[PDB]
Structure 1
């Protein structure tokens, strides 16, 4: 009638992704972890775009959308910021937003590529993902400019999570897999021989799927959390766990208050 004891071991750690396995937990708990990974991990993305000039061939809302999809390096500032709906201030302050500026004009006859490098933040640590790639790769293109064309804009970056908009989704690919060999047979293969073996499967080439066990329960949940570049893949999981824990704590507080008010 109590909680179970989960264990985690890391199978691969990289600036791009984290691959690991969680043991001795529930399928619902694992799915909710995978689900907070996509939905309820707050990051910093720009949500307020003011365009002072746009002579490009991509219109203003197109430019604003492409700007908003640009990830921003927010590893620790997202924890110390506040939601703009919760901050006591007016329109924007440094305590709940980050100002961005973009003033590019094409003057030479060569086509000018407006990239995320051209975005100048007010906070030096909250920047796009052009931070470090040494140990050649390009940067996120925004728009291309013809000679004489320009665009000037000022933007603010808010704190949000992927349930509002997909631009606050810190993860690119969250691989989820449990029971790679169909021992539980939660899925039914009409021809198991035609199905390729999973990466985490432990079977010889002779055998196609694990023998059925009626007593089995879903465990050994395999994750591969791939970061888009805003948060580190290792801290995405920590932030998701903290967010789920605080959400559960808030629900418990509301329930306790309601019960003590009903009694």
Structure 2
């Protein structure tokens, strides 16, 4: 339609972790809905079934199962071709809808052993390993760098289990969050008066509020509308930041186009003559 504006993007900054950008000339409802997709709708792989062969550790089993689900997983190369479990024709699991992990450790040593993310092995090809320690040459590598201490073991304890990771999205459980956090900010100088400051001098100025550099603090304009939203998406590490954004928009496109097909389905099946 003629009244759709071309918004606009600018990437301010990009790292292996963060992606920080500005969206301009668009609606807040768009900005807010797109921020919500970054959390909930972007799909990923995380452990979903844990089968415990032997567990002599001082942590109870369901605790091991909890810590273990929550650990992060690379998915970028494979999260797309993977299908959803319920949709897949197979009974239980298969190579085509899930990937398998195996963990086997025993404390035969006199010193306390730690159980870590590297000790967890993918029966699936090393296309989808755990986040930490693989292709590395990583300056983020410090001391142990176990990514997670699944448990500690004293001389005599042992741990054997199987796990099946599956594709799903954050609306269903928090283990599937593809974000470390999501900053969102709009109209930093409070031109539009969406908040009303009592004694405005008592508030600090963000890094986006530098415009008048002065201390005049918030010049008013009532003819304005919300424009130019600032973002800073931050990667949990399990999916690189730009891929989070591109997959979010596509998923949102997929969800919208589908609602259009059902709305079409109303005009095709049960001919739209009710109203």
**How high is the TM-score relative to the length of structure 1?**
0.95
Cα distance in 1 between the residues matched to 2:5 and 2:126: 39
Find the counterpart in structure 2 of residue 188 from structure 1. Answer: 196
Cα distance in 1 between the residues matched to 2:119 and 2:131: 10
Change (3 A) 1:10 1:140: same
Cα distance in 2 between the residues matched to 1:24 and 1:98: 43
Render the CA deviation track for 1:8-46: whole Å, top value 9, x for unaligned: 111111111100001111100001111000000000001
Cα distance in 2 between the residues matched to 1:208 and 1:118: 58
Find the counterpart in structure 2 of residue 158 from structure 1. Answer: 166
Alpha-carbon contact 1:106-1:149 (below 8 Å) kept: yes
Q: Does 1:116 align with 2:117?
A: yes
Cα distance in 2 between the residues matched to 1:127 and 1:110: 32
Which residue of 198, 209, 231 corresponds with 1:223?
231
**How high is the TM-score relative to the length of structure 2?**
0.91
Q: Does 1:40 align with 2:41?
A: yes
What does residue range 90-101 of structure 1 map to in structure 2 within 5 Å? 90-101=91-102
What does residue range 13-162 of structure 1 map to in structure 2 within 5 Å? 13-131=14-132, 137-162=145-170
Cα distance in 2 between the residues matched to 1:198 and 1:68: 37
Cα distance in 1 between the residues matched to 2:40 and 2:23: 20
Alpha-carbon contact 1:129-1:229 (below 8 Å) kept: no
Alpha-carbon contact 2:131-2:238 (below 8 Å) kept: no
Deviation (angstroms), 1:219:
1.3
- Structure 2 residue matching 1:174: 3-state secondary structure: strand
Find the counterpart in structure 2 of residue 12 from structure 1. Answer: 13
Change (3 A) 1:125 1:3: farther
Alpha-carbon contact 1:203-1:209 (below 8 Å) kept: no
Deviation (angstroms), 1:56:
0.6
Cα distance in 2 between the residues matched to 1:65 and 1:126: 24
Q: Does 1:200 align with 2:200?
A: no
Render the CA deviation track for 1:227-254: whole Å, top value 9, x for unaligned: 1111001110001001101000000000
Cα distance in 2 between the residues matched to 1:132 and 1:109: 26
Matched length: 262
Deviation (angstroms), 1:172:
1.0
- Structure 2 residue matching 1:103: 3-state secondary structure: strand
Deviation (angstroms), 1:210:
2.5
Render the CA deviation track for 1:89-133: whole Å, top value 9, x for unaligned: 111111110100000111111111101111101223454544458
Structure 2's unaligned 5+ residue stretches are: 136-143
Alpha-carbon contact 1:114-1:143 (below 8 Å) kept: yes
Structure 1's unaligned 5+ residue stretches are: none
Alpha-carbon contact 1:173-1:225 (below 8 Å) kept: yes
Find the counterpart in structure 1 of residue 251 from structure 2. Answer: 243
- Structure 1 residue matching 2:80: 3-state secondary structure: helix
